């Protein structure tokens, strides 16, 4: 009558992994940047009429500590691949996060969603079309989000749950 999902949020430094998670969990945003070491959250939600517990692992945007990061990927059931629409390097980084998940999980079919965050800002450097093309090439959804305005926040996490439910 319930289900439970282990979701992992990954992506480059400063893209909004924590701000997205805190918006989902605590329904607020702060401008202050507090770099992540590691945080875990748990929340009960209803998605498509089905109640679930989400266990969300918010990771640091560094790829050092491969032993730890590999374990994050082995345990995680689905991944948000977050970049910021005003950080071109963070978008160019996306393929590396996807490749790491495939290699660690030894699979070409892992539940993932591409998330283009900071959509509220007027400093865009990554075109939406480029992001849609990349997600299409990967066969995964693309969601535009803003942790600041809450645009797309529920959508991103819920779509990832649908990708897990579909994958199974």
């Amino acid at each position: 009558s319930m289900t439970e999902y282990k979701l992992v949020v990954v992506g480059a430094c400063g893209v909004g992994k924590s701000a997205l998670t805190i918006q989902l969990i605590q329904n607020h945003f702060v401008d202050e940047y507090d770099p992540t070491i590691e945080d875990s959250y748990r929340k009960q939600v209803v998605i498509d009429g089905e109640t679930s517990l989400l266990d969300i692992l918010d990771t640091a945007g560094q790829e050092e500590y491969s032993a730890m990061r590999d374990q994050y990927m082995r345990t995680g059931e689905g991944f948000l691949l977050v970049f910021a629409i005003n950080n071109t390097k963070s978008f160019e980084d996306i393929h590396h996060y996807r490749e790491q998940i495939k290699r660690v999980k030894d699979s070409e079919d892992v539940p993932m969603v591409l998330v283009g965050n900071k959509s509220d800002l007027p400093s865009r450097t990554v075109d939406t079309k480029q992001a849609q093309d990349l997600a299409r090439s990967y066969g995964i959804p693309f969601i535009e989000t803003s942790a600041k305005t809450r645009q797309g926040v529920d959508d991103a996490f819920y779509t990832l749950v649908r990708e897990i439910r579909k994958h199974k």
Binding site: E32, Y33, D34, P35, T36, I37, E38, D39
Partner: protein, 162 residues
């Protein structure tokens, strides 16, 4: 080699004194930055700032006196200075080394090892070690956590050169 001290406080209550030998003989620019930030002689420095990240089994990190949130700090030379050398290594508890955001980004943030942290060799500049008060550093660990958040405010209540 100069010696500096920190008087550490927990929610303002004195915990104890830690003193450090600074390897001016091998790392003069980096040692001088930390020495001057500790006396406050340039008009800014460590007095009052907090150890914002304490992770038991690894290290105690502090030194952000500009933003007071773990993201800031500044050197006596500018916002950032180059990695001077990597002669000294993170060989065990008590090593004092610079925190950074990548190559050549030394400011004021630093860390005190509570373990051998050899994977940091060649990426962080080691410039001193605890002389007296390693027991104070070990006590600071009780206030840390896996993500480094502290359960009470751990501050440099006083600091200076001996």
């Amino acid at each position: 080699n100069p010696t500096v001290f920190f008087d550490i406080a927990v929610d303002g209550e004195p915990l104890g004194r830690v003193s450090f030998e600074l390897f001016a003989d091998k790392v003069p620019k980096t040692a001088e930055n930390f020495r001057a930030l500790s006396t406050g002689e340039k008009g800014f420095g460590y007095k009052g700032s907090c150890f914002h990240r304490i992770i038991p089994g690894f290290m105690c990190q502090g030194g952000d006196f500009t933003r007071h949130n773990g993201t800031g700090g500044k050197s006596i030379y500018g916002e950032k200075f180059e990695d001077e050398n990597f002669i000294l290594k993170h060989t065990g508890p008590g090593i004092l080394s610079m925190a950074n955001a990548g190559p050549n980004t030394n400011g004021s943030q630093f860390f005190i090892c509570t373990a051998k942290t050899e994977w940091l060799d060649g990426k962080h500049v080691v410039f001193g070690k605890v002389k007296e008060g390693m027991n104070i550093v070990e006590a600071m660990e009780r206030f840390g956590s896996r993500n480094g958040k502290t359960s009470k405010k751990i501050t440099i209540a006083d600091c200076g050169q001996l």
